[PDB]
Amino acid sequence: TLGPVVTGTSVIAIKYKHGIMIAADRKASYGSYAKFQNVERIFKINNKTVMGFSGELADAQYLHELLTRKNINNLSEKKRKEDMYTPQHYHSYVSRVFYVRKNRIDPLFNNIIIAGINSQKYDNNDDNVLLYTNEEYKEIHKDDLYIGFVDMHGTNFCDDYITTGYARYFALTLLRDHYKDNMTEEEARILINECLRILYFRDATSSNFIQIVKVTSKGVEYEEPYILPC
Amino acid sequence: RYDSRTTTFSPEGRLYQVEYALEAINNASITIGLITKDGVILGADKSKLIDNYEKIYKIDKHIFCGVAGLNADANILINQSRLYAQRYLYNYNEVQPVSQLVVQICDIKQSYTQYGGLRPYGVSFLIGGYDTKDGYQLYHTDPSGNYSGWFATAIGTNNLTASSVLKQEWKNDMTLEEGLLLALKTLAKSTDTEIPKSEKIELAYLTNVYQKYLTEKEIEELIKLYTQK
Amino acid sequence: SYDRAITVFSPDGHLLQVEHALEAVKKGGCAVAIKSSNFAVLAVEKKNIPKLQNPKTTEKLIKLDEHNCLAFAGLNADARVLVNKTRLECQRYYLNMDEPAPVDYIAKYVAKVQQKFTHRGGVRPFGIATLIAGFKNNKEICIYQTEPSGIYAAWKAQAIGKNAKIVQEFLEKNYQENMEQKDCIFLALKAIFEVVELSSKNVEVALLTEKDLTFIEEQEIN
Amino acid sequence: YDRHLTIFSPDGNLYQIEYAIKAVKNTNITSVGVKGENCAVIISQKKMAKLLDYNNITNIYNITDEIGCSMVGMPGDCLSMVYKARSEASEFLYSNGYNVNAETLCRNICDKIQVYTQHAYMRLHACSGMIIGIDENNKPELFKFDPSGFCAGYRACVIGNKEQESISVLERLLEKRKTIDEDIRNTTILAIEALQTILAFDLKASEIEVAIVSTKNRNFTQISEKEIDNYLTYIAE
Amino acid sequence: GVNTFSPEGRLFQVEYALGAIKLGSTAVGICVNDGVILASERRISSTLIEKDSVEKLLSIDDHIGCAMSGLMADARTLIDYARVECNHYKFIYNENINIKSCVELISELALDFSNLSIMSRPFGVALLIGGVDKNGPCLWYTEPSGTNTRFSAASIGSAQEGAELLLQENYKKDMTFEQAEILALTVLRQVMEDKLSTSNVEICAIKKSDQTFYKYNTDDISRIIDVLP
Amino acid sequence: YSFSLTTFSPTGKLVQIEYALNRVSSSSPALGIRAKNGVIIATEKNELIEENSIFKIQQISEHIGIVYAGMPGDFRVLLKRARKEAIRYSLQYGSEILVKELVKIIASIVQEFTQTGGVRPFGLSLLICGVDVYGYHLYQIDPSGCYFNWMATCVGKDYQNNMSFLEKRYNKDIEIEDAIHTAILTLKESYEKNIEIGVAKPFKILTQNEIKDYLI
Amino acid sequence: GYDLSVSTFSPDGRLYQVEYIYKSINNNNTALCLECKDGIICCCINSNMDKNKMIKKNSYNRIYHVNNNIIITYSGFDGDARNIIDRARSEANTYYYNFHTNIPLHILVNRISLYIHAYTLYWHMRPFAASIIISSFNEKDKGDIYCIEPNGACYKYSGIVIGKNKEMFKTEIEKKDYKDINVRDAIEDIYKFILTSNKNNLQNLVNFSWICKESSYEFQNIHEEILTPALNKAV
Amino acid sequence: TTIIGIIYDNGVMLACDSRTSTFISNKCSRKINRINENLYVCRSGASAHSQKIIEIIKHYCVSMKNENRKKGRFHVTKNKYFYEDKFNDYNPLVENVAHITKKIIYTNNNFLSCALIFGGYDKIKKQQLYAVNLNGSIIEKHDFAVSGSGSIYIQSYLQDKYKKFMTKKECFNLILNCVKYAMHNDNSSGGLIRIVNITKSFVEEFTVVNTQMNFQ
Amino acid sequence: LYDTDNIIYSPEGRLYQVEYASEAIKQGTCAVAIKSKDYVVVSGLKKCISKLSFPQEKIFKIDDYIGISMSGITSDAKVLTKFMQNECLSHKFLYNENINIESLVRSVADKYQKNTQKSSKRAFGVGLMIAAYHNEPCIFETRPNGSYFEYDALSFGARSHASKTYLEKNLHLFEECSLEELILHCLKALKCSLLTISNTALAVVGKNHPWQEISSLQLEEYLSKVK
C-alpha cells in the first residue's frame, strides 16, 4: 500500500452518561471524486467494542477482518462473560499490529478509534452471545468507558473523547471547549451534530450523510443514517 | 526397527558394510595396472550379442581408471571424479595432480561410511595418471576411502595370483611393449589359462599426455607377440 | 540413521561405540613421540609390500601447519579426514588470530571434534588416536595425545597404536628427560622396535624443530 | 519384515500392494463403468464400505464439471484420492489453460500413487477408481486405477468383489449389444443390468447411484431416482 | 531408543549415565561463610604424563569453579558451554552471574537430547560447581538426571560414599576457612589410595573476601599437609 | 528417517537388487534387435482393456524409443523422467539428446534408488533404442543401474531360451524387415494382438495392420 | 507382526492400529447428538469420572463450538480432540478470510476428515484417538449431524451415539422418532436414557447443549432451570 | 476503458467497451470475462494484471464449485445460455468470489493496479454487484457500479436516469446509452459494446454496434 | 512390543509410553492445593537427599497471580515453567492485562499433547498443579497425555492417598474456611502423607494477594498451630 486511494474522512467518538457514541459520515472518496456515499466506516468488533477508521478503506477492511477473526476465536474459547476481550485488549492488539508494520515499512494508511465498555459488571449480554441477530440504559462511569486512538506510526493512547482526520482540528476544538462528564444522549447528539456540521462546512471530503453508533448497557446499536438537519 | 545402521562400528572396530563391499569387489572381475618408463598400463578381463569398455574409463586427458565391484556405483564415482578434475582445472587453471583427485574421490567414498544412514560404494579403483610433479602414478582405492600408491597391483578375483606374477615379473626398466606383455601374462595367469583370449581383455595405456584404448585387433597382435615368447 | 543416535549408554554406563573406536585404534600401526628441550621426535611404523607398493604414498607423519605436526594410529581414511579438518582449523585460527595455532589449541580442537562426533546423531566416532607435537605461544614444545572418545592429555613421551602398553612401559624406564637429538632419535627408535620387526623399511622417524619438521634420511636409520 | 515396507521380497513381489488390493475388495462395494458410442456411465451400490442419512452415502464424486469418478476403498483414502484428483485437475486447468481429460488425470494420479508404492515411509491408499469424461474428440472415457498404480483404459470395467466372473458378464452383454438419446438410454440400461447381474439380487432404486457423461451433455451428472426406477422397471418388463 | 520411558517411569539413558559418573578421581567441595573450597585427587596413570595437563578443577568464570567426574570429554564440553554462557550473561548484564543460574544453564544443556521444545545423548558427567555471588559462597551438584542440588559439603567420584560419610561426620556450620581446608584434605587423604602428597591433589578456593578463583600451588598444599593431623 | 533399505549382504550382494531382478525375470517378455540400417524393439502382451491405453513401447524423443519389462508404474515414472531429461538436453544444446548420454543419465537416476534412504529399487529393466549421428544404439538398463550395449537381447521371462534363439539367428548385416521377422519368431517362441513393435527416420510404432502384414 | 505401525497393511487388508483406536474410543465416555423437531441436542455423559469427587462441579466439558453455530463434541482423548477442534477452528478462520462467509458444514467435515486421515499414512505419527461429532441446525435446512471416525470416515446421521454403551443408547433413542419432538421434550428422554443405560451425579457429570429455535439457532449451554426439572421427572 | 454494471428487477447487467490502448492496440478486447456460468466480472486498469487476476480467480472458483457439491441426490447479436445448475447448489456465491478477489488484489497491491466489477446471481442474495477498487477495497453496490477512465463522464447522467426497479428493456437502454456516451467523451474507450445480462435462470450476451447522433 | 514407541497403540487401545510418563509422576514428593472463596493455598514436601543437602524447591512462581507445583521429572518441569513464564510475560507485553488462566492451561496442555504424537519425541514426564486467581481462586492439573482438569482441591505425588482421604473428608469446609484455617487444612493434609521450616514449602494466592510464599517465621508459627 504505497498510499491512500479510497479514503474515509473524520471520525468522532465521545463518552456520554450511558456509554460510547461514535459518529462518522458514510462517504468514501477517490481523490477529489466522491465515488461512494453509503460506506460503513464504523465496524462493530464485539458486543462491547466498536471500530472507526479514517484513511485507506482496503487497510481498514483488512484490519476489520483481523479483528473479526480475533473476536470469533475469543468466543470459541470463551466460557464466562469475563473471558470476552475488552476494548482495551483490542486497542493494544491494533497498536501492536501498527507497530510491527511500522518496523516493516508496510503501514496501514489509517487512523483507528477503538471504543467500547471495559466492564462486564453492567449487563449480562455476553452470557449468551448472538452473532447473526440483534429496560432502560444503565448509567456507566466514565472510567469503565474506553476510547483509544492509534495512528500510522502506532501512536496509541486513550481519552474521554477522540477525533480523527479533520475532526482533530474542527471537532476537537468544540469537544475541548464544551465536553462535560455524564452527558445525556440528547446533549451528546447535539454536540456531535454541531461538530459534524462544522466538518461538512469546512472539510471537502466530509458528507452530511451521518452514521451514529452507540455502545451501551444493551450492546451496540446502529442508528438510522440521517442527513444532517440543516 | 527397519533401520540397519550401516554407519556403526562392529564390536571389533570393524565396519560390516565396508567388509561386505570388499567381499563383493573381491568377487568382481580382475583388473590390473603397472608402471613402465613409457607410461601406465591397465588390463582387465570383461553373451555373444553384447556389442564397449566396462572396466577402464577415462577421467581426464591425464587420468584414467580401472574398475572393480559394482558397475553402477563405479559409474557414479567416475562421473563425480570427472566433475572434480574439471572443477580443479576451473579453479586453478591447471590440471589436477592425480593424488589430489584420488583423495577427493576417496573422501566421497569414506563420508558414506561415516555420515548418514546409507551404504558404502561397493567399488574399488585403480587410478592411473601422469602429472609433472610426480610423473606416472598408479593408486588403489578401496571402498572405505583408504588408498595407496603402487608400481603394479591387482584388484578383483584372484588378485593374489596376479599380484604374485606381477611381483615376480615386474621390473623397473621395462618399456611399453614389455609392460603390455606382462599385463597379458598376468591376465592369463589369474584366469588359470595357458593362453589369454582376445575377447576378454581390456588394455589401455597413458603416456606423455595421450591415452590409448586398444581395439581387439591390436590386442590380437599383442597376443601374437606374447605367444612367440 | 540420518539423525539416529549411534553412540548410546550401555546398561553399565559405557559408550560401546567409543570402545569400538578404541579397538580400531588398537588395530592400527604403532607410533611413538618423544619430547626434548626444544625439539621432538616422532617415529611411526610403516608396512608396505616390497617392490609393488610405492613407499612415498602413505604419510602417517603429517605436518599440520608451519609449527605443528601429527601422527595417528587407526583407520587411515578417518585419519586423513580429521587431518584435513585440523589443517583447515589451523589456517582459520591463523587468519582470525593473526598468530599461528599453538599446539595445545590444535590438540584441543581435535579432541573437541572427536567428542562432537561421539555426541551427535547420524555420525560414527573417529576410530583414530593422534599424537600432535608442536610449540606453544611461549615457544615451549609440547606433545599431546588425543583418543577416540575426545579425551586428550599432554605427555613427555607417549606411544599409540598396537602394542602401545609395552612401548609405554619401555619409554617409562628409558626416557631420561632432556636428551640430545641423536640419542633422542635412537631412543625413539629402540622403543618402537621392541614391537615391530627390526628393519629400516618398518619405520619412518621425523624430527620437529623451531625451523621446520625434517624426515630423517634412511642412512642414519641404517 | 519383508512384507511390511514397500520393498521387494525373495520372489520379487510387493506384498503390500496385494494387501491394499485386498483392502479395496474388503469394502464390499461394487461399481461398474460402461462406455457407449457417445456416452459413458458409472453405477455404484450407494452403500457404506437406522438413523444414518442414506442419501449422504455415496461412492461417486465429481472431479470437475465434465469429469467424474467412482472411488471404492477405505472411505478416508477415497476422499483423499478425490481431493488429490480435484487438485490435479485445477492445477492442470490453471497451468495449461484448458480442462484436463480423463486419461491425463488417471496417469497423473498413478504417477502419484507410485510415490507411495516406492517410498517406504508412506502407506498405500486402499482406493480404486473409475474416471469418466468426454474427450476433446467427443468420445467417452473410462479409465480404472488400483492401489498398485496401474491405470488402464477400458470399454467396460468393474471394481468390487467379483472379478473374473463379472468380466464374462460384461463380455456377454457387450457382444450382445454389438440416436444419441437411444445410445444414452441403452448404455444406462446395460450398466444397470450389469450391476444387477453381478450382484445376483434384485436392485432397489434408492440403493444405487448412476452418473453419466455424454456428448449431448458433457457435464458429469447424476440421474434422479425416478429415472433409475423407470430403468429397473423396464429391465423387469 | 534414547527418549524411551521404562515401565517404572524412569528414562533408561539417564539411568545408565548414572553409572558413568561413579568413575574417575574423587573430588570434595566444602562451603563455609568465608568461601568455597574444591579439592580433587589425581590418579596419575603414568610418570610420563604432564600431571598439570589433566585438570579436574576448572574455572567456569572468575568467581566460579567446578570439579568434574565421569566422562571427562563430555565434562569439558559442559564447562566450555558454561563459560560461554557466563560470559554472555556478564556482557548483557555487566555483573557476575548467580551460581544457581549457571548450574541451571548447565542442566538445561545437559537434557537437550530429549528435544522437548543438539546433543544426541545424556552427558554422563557429575559437576560439583562452587562459587561466590552476592548471596555469598555456595556449592551445587549437577548429575546426568538434570536435577541440581545445593550442598553445604559434598563429594563425587569413585570414593563418593566414603567422602560423603566423612563430610557428614566432620562438617559443622561454624567452621573457619583453615578448618575447611584441613577437613577437605583429611577426607581426600582417607579416600584416595595413592598416599597424599604435594603433587597428588588440586585445591581451588573462591573466598568471600575477593570472590576470585584461586588454584593452590605446591607451597599452599605443603602448608596444609604440615597442618594435617 | 532416511536410511538405505538396500544393504550389502554378508556375502557382498545387494539382495534387494537381486529380488528386483527376480521380479523383472518373472515379467512379460520384451526384446530388441539392432539391424544394419535400423533397430527394433518388440514386446508381447480380455475383450475389455483398450489396447491403445497400455502400450509398453513408448517414444522418448523423435529418434529415441523405450520399452520395459517389469512394473508398469515404475516404468511410467522413469519414462516421464527420461522425457524430462531429453528435453533438458535439448534446451541446453539445441539438438536431440544422444542415446548413450540419455542411457547414462537414466542409469544414474536408477542407481540413486539403490543407495538413497527410504526407497526400494526400480522393479523394471529397460530397452532403449535410438538413432544419432553415431549410428543405431540398443541399450539395456538393469534395476541395479548398470547399462549394457547390445546388438540384440531379450529381458523378460524365459529370456535364456530367447537369447539363445536370437544368438542362433542374428547377423550384423540384416535388413530391418529380416530383423522384424526374427523378432516376431522369437516372441512367438516365448509365447497379432499380442505383438507391439517399434522401429527406427523418427521412431515409429507399428500399427496393428502393419504387424499383421508382417505375420503373414 | 503387522500391527506395530499404522502404515502397514495386514495380509487381510486391515490396519490393526485403527482397530485398536476404535477399541480405545469404545472404552471412553459417552457422547451423542440428536436431531429434534426444532433443533439439535448434544449431550456428553462422563461416566468414568464418577470416582473423581474433587473435580470442580460441571467443569469438565467435551462440548465445543465453531462460529457459534456448529456444535463439536468428541469421544476419545482430550489432547487429540483439542487438536482436532483447533484445526476445525483454524479451517473456519481461513475460510472466512478467503470468502467472507461461514464455512459450509459439509466442507468443514471433509477438511476435518482429511486432517484426521493424513495421520494414518506415515510411520512416524500417532493417529488420532477420537471420534468426532459436528452438528448444526438452520431455520431453512433443519439439522445436519456428521460423525467422523478415527480413520477419516465421515457419515451423516439424524442421531448418533459414540463411546461406551452406545448400542443401548442407540436402541433407546431409536425407540421413537425425534423429528416430531421438540428439544425440551427430548431433554427428559435423554436423562431417562442415561439413567436406564445415577440420580446424584446427573447434575455434575453431564454436559448439555443445543442449537434450536429458542437460542436463535446458535450455540448455547442448557441453562440449569431447564435441565433440573427434566432430570427430576426422569428420576 | 469503460465498465458499468446496473441492477434491474430480475437481473443484473454488465456492459463494457472493447478498445485497448494513443494507439489502439486491440480495438476489440473482451473485458467482461465469464468467471462462472452465473458470475461475470469486468476488468479495468492494467490489462496484464487484471487478466492474471481473472485467471487466478477462475482457478479458485473451480476449486470452490467442485468442493461445494454435496453427496447424494436431491429432488445487435445475442447468445443465451441457461445455467447447468438449476438451483445454485454448487455454484460459488458472488460475494465469496468477489472477496477472494479483493484478498488477492490487496495482498499484492504494491504493484497490482486492477479495478474490477463483479456481477452475479446466487440464491442467497439474488443478483449482486461488487466493486473491487485500486488498493483492494470491496464495496457492494445495490444500484450500480462504474469504473474506467470513460465512466467518469456518465456519472451524473447515470445518477439521473437510474430507477430503483427498472425493467429489462429500459435497463438495457440505460446501460447502452451510458456506454455510448462514455465512449463518445472518452478517447481511451471505443469499439463494439459487449453487454452481459445475468438473471435467475440464464445469462444473455449481446454485442452492439453504435453511433452517437445528436442535434445539440 | 507396544511400549517401545511413543506413537503406538496397544490392542487394548492404550498408549504405554504415556502411561509410563504418568507413572513417573507417582514417585515425586506429595503436594496439595486447596481453595476457598478467595484464596488458593499450595503446600508441598521438599525432597532431601542427604543431611548436608539443601531441600529441593517444590513450588514456582509463574506470574503475579499464578504459581505451580510439580511432581515427576524436574528438567521437564523447568522447561514447562519457562514456557509458562514467557507466555504470561509475552501476554502482558503484547496487551496490558494478565493472561486468562484457562488459556494458559490450555496452551500448556497443547504443549503436552504435541509431544505425544511424534516418534522422535516423548511425553513430558511431570504432572503440574497450577494455582492462580483470575477473578476466582482456580486450581488446574495437567497430565502427560495432554488432558487437564479443574479441581476444588487437589493432591499428587508419593503417598497422596492419605492427603486425598483427608481432603475428601474436609472438602465441604474449604469453601467457607478463612485463610488461616485453609492454610492449616492444607498443612494437615500434607502431614497425613508423611514437617519443619526446611522440608515444607507453602504459598498462597488470592484476591488482592499476589502469589507469595509463606515466610519462615510464619511457617514456624503455622506448624506450631498444627501441633
Give C130's contacts (C-beta < 8 A, 6+ positions apart).
C70, C71, C72, C73, C79, C82, C110, C145, C146, C160
Tell me which amino acid residue A6 is.
V
Q: Whole-angstrom Cα distance, residue G90 to residue G92? A: 5
Rounded to a whole number of angstroms, the CA Rg of chain F reads: 17
Which cell goes with D105? 488425470
Q: Whole-angstrom Cα distance, residue H189 to residue C78? A: 77
Q: Which of I119, I147, I152 sits opposite G79 (nearest CB)?
A: I147
Way the structure was solved: cryo-EM
Residue of F48, F52, F75 to mutate, testing the D interface (most D Cβ within 10 Å of its Cβ): F48
Q: Whole-angstrom Cα distance, residue D183 to residue D40? A: 10
CB D35 within 8 Å of CB D140:
yes
Q: C-alpha B56: how far from its chain's center?
A: 7
**Which of E:90-129 have CB within 8 Å of I?**
104, 107-108, 110-111, 114-117
Burial category of A104 from C-beta neighbours within 10 Å (exposed 0-12, middle 13-18, buried 19 and up): exposed
F117/C3 Cβ within 8 A: no
Which cell goes with G155? 457419515
Residue F126's nearest CA partner among F168, F74, F161 is F74
The DSSP H or E segment spanning A97 is helix A87-102
SS3 state of residue D140: strand
Q: Which residues of F are less than 8 Å from C1 in CB distance?
A: 3
Residue A9's nearest CA partner among A228, A217, A206 is A206
Q: How far is CA A202 from CA A12, A174, A229, G13, in A?
A: 16, 14, 17, 79
Q: Could you give the domains of chain I?
A: 1-227 (3.60.20.10)
Phi, psi of F163 (to 5 degrees): -60, -40
Strands H144-147 and D60-64: unpaired
User: Which residues partner with F109 through β-bridges?
Assistant: none
Tell me which amino acid residue F25 is.
S
CB F167 within 8 Å of CB F151:
no
Domain C16-222 sits in CATH 3.30.390.50: no
State the residue range of the domain holding D123.
Answer: 1-236
I110/G17 Cβ within 8 A: no
Q: Which of I4, I20, I52 sits opposite E9 (nearest CB)?
A: I20
As a whole number of Å, the end-to-end CA separation of chain G is: 50
In this complex, which chains have at least 3 CB pairs below 8 Å with chain I? A, E, G
Q: Whole-angstrom Cα distance, residue F92 to residue E108? A: 54
Residue C22's nearest CA partner among C165, C169, C133 is C165
CB I189 within 8 Å of CB I166:
yes
CB F87 within 8 Å of CB D186:
no
- For chain G, the residue count is 235
Burial category of F84 from C-beta neighbours within 10 Å (exposed 0-12, middle 13-18, buried 19 and up): exposed
Residue with cell 580442537: C109
CB H129 within 8 Å of CB H41:
no
User: Which residues partner with A133 through β-bridges?
Assistant: none
CB B65 within 8 Å of CB B126:
yes
Please report the number of interchain residue pairs, chain B to chain C, with beta-carbon separation below 8 angstroms: 107
Closest-CA distance of chain G to residue H203, Å: 24
Q: Say how many C-beta atoms besides its own lie within 10 A of residue E49's C-beta.
A: 18
CB B61 within 8 Å of CB B198:
no
Decide if H1 is catalytic. Answer: yes
How is I59-86 classified by DSSP, letter by letter?
A: EEEEETTEEEEEEE-HHHHHHHHHHHHH
Give G61's contacts (C-beta < 8 A, 6+ positions apart).
G44, G207
Interchain CB contact of A40 with H (< 8 Å): no
Q: Could you give the domains of chain H?
A: 1-212 (3.60.20.10)
Residue E88's nearest CA partner among E108, E60, E116, E65 is E60
CA angle in degrees (0–180, nearest 5) for B170-B173-B175: 85
Phi, psi of I8 (to 5 degrees): -105, 145
Task: Provide the residue ranges of all domains of chain E, joining segments of one domain with +.
Answer: 2-225
CB C108 within 8 Å of CB C102:
no
Residue B141's nearest CA partner among B176, B117, B106, B165 is B106
B60-76: string of b/e by CB count within 10 Å (b at 16+)? bebbbbbbbbbbbbbbb
Interchain CB contact of E76 with C (< 8 Å): yes
Residue of G94, G97, G100, G140 to mutate, testing the H interface (most H Cβ within 10 Å of its Cβ): G100
Q: Whole-angstrom Cα distance, residue B80 to residue B70? A: 15
SS3 state of residue D186: helix
**Which of B:57-116 have CB within 8 Å of C?**
99, 103, 106-107, 109-111, 113-116
H152/A59 Cβ within 8 A: no
Phi, psi of B72 (to 5 degrees): -70, -45
Tell me which amino acid residue F93 is.
Y
Rounded to a whole number of angstroms, the CA Rg of chain A reads: 17
Q: Whole-angstrom Cα distance, residue E181 to residue E165? A: 17
Name the closest residue on chain A to residue G70, using Cα atoms. A76
Interchain CB contact of G96 with D (< 8 Å): no
Q: Whole-angstrom Cα distance, residue C193 to residue C203? A: 8
Q: C-alpha C215: how far from its chain's center?
A: 16
Which cell goes with E2? 534414547
Number of domains in chain D: 1
Residue with cell 429397473: D232
Q: Say how many C-beta atoms besides its own lie within 10 A of residue A120's C-beta.
A: 19
Q: Say how many C-beta atoms besides its own lie within 10 A of residue I135's C-beta.
A: 12
Give H13's contacts (C-beta < 8 A, 6+ positions apart).
H5, H6, H7, H119, H171, H172, H175, H195, H196, H197, H198
Tell me which amino acid residue G68 is.
N
Give G104's contacts (C-beta < 8 A, 6+ positions apart).
H68
Give G13's contacts (C-beta < 8 A, 6+ positions apart).
D19, D20, D21, D22, D23, D24, D25, D26, D126
Which cell goes with B221? 597382435
The CATH number of domain E2-225, selected from 3.40.50.300, 3.60.20.10, 3.40.720.10, 3.40.50.2300: 3.60.20.10
Of H1, H2, H20, H101, which residue is the catalytic one?
H1
Residue of D47, D74, D83, D86 to mutate, testing the G interface (most G Cβ within 10 Å of its Cβ): D74
G22/I171 Cβ within 8 A: no
Residue B35's nearest CA partner among B220, B209, B180, B190 is B180
Tell me which amino acid residue I95 is.
Y
Interchain CB contact of E147 with I (< 8 Å): yes
CB D70 within 8 Å of CB D24:
no
Q: Could you give the domains of chain F?
A: 5-216 (3.60.20.10)
Q: Which residues of C are less than 8 Å from B103 in CB distance?
A: 80
How is chain F classified by DSSP, letter by letter?
A: ---BSS-B-TTS-BHHHHHHHHHHHTS--EEEEE-SS-EEEEEE---SB-GGGG-S-EEEETTEEEEEEE-HHHHHHHHHHHHHHHHHHHHHHSSPPPHHHHHHHHHHHHHHTTTSBTBPPP-EEEEEEEEETTEEEEEEE-TTS-EEEESEEE-STTHHHHHHHHHTT--SS--HHHHHHHHHHHHHHH--TTEEEEE----EE--HHHHHHHH-
B20/F8 Cβ within 8 A: yes
G54/I150 Cβ within 8 A: no
Which cell goes with G68? 457459534
Which cell goes with F32? 530388441
CB F163 within 8 Å of CB F153:
yes
Mark residue E58 as left, alpha or beta (left: phi above 0; alpha: psi -120 to 50; beta: remaining).
Answer: beta
Q: Whole-angstrom Cα distance, residue D124 to residue D140? A: 29
Interchain CB contact of F9 with D (< 8 Å): no
Q: Whole-angstrom Cα distance, residue E46 to residue E41? A: 15
Q: Which residues of I are less than 8 Å from E1 in CB distance?
A: 4-5
How is C111-130 classified by DSSP, letter by letter?
A: HHHHHHHHSSBTBPPP-EEE
Closest-CA distance of chain E to residue I120, Å: 8
D149/F118 Cβ within 8 A: no
Q: Which residues of H are less than 8 Å from G106 in CB distance?
A: 70-71
Residue H72's nearest CA partner among G112, D59, D34, D133 is D59
How is D38-98 classified by DSSP, letter by letter?
A: SEEEEEE-------B-TTT--SEEEEETTEEEEEEE-HHHHHHHHHHHHHHHHHHHHHHSS
Regarding chains D and E, contact by 3 or more CB pairs under 8 A is answered as no
**Resolution in angstroms for this experimental structure?**
3.1
Helix D102-118 to helix D75-96 angle (10° resolution) is 120
As a whole number of Å, the end-to-end CA separation of chain B is: 62
Q: C-alpha G6: how far from its chain's center?
A: 25
**Which of H:49-68 have CB within 8 Å of D?**
55-56, 58-59, 62-63, 65-67
Regarding chains I and G, contact by 3 or more CB pairs under 8 A is answered as yes
G86/I118 Cβ within 8 A: no
Number of domains in chain G: 1
The DSSP H or E segment spanning I134 is none
Q: Whole-angstrom Cα distance, residue G149 to residue G24? A: 12
CB G88 within 8 Å of CB I188:
no
Q: Whole-angstrom Cα distance, residue E111 to residue E93? A: 26
Q: Which residues of C are less than 8 Å from B10 in CB distance?
A: 20
SS3 state of residue E172: coil
Helix B71-92 to helix B98-114 angle (10° resolution) is 130
Q: Which of D3, D49, D122 sits opposite G121 (nearest CB)?
A: D122
Q: Which of I4, I75, I83 sits opposite E111 (nearest CB)?
A: I75
Closest-CA distance of chain F to residue D52, Å: 37
Closest-CA distance of chain F to residue C111, Å: 29
Q: Which of E13, E22, E49 sits opposite C9 (nearest CB)?
A: E13
Q: Which residues of B are less than 8 Å from F3 in CB distance?
A: 3-4, 6, 116-118
A96/I94 Cβ within 8 A: yes
Strands F147-150 and E213-215: unpaired
Residue with cell 498398485: D148
C1-12: string of b/e by CB count within 10 Å (b at 16+)? bbbbbbbbbeee
The DSSP H or E segment spanning C170 is helix C164-174
E4/I122 Cβ within 8 A: yes
CA angle in degrees (0–180, nearest 5) for G96-G101-G105: 90
E-assigned strands of chain C? 31-35, 40-44, 61-63, 69-74, 128-135, 141-146, 152-155, 157-160, 204-208, 213-215
Residue with cell 477522540: A162
Q: C-alpha I199: how far from its chain's center?
A: 17
CATH classification of the domain holding G54: 3.60.20.10
Q: Which of A79, A82, A89 sits opposite I95 (nearest CB)?
A: A89
Q: Whole-angstrom Cα distance, residue E194 to residue I18? A: 49
CB H53 within 8 Å of CB H44:
no
Q: Which of A69, A73, A131 sits opposite G97 (nearest CB)?
A: A69
Which cell goes with C98? 593473526
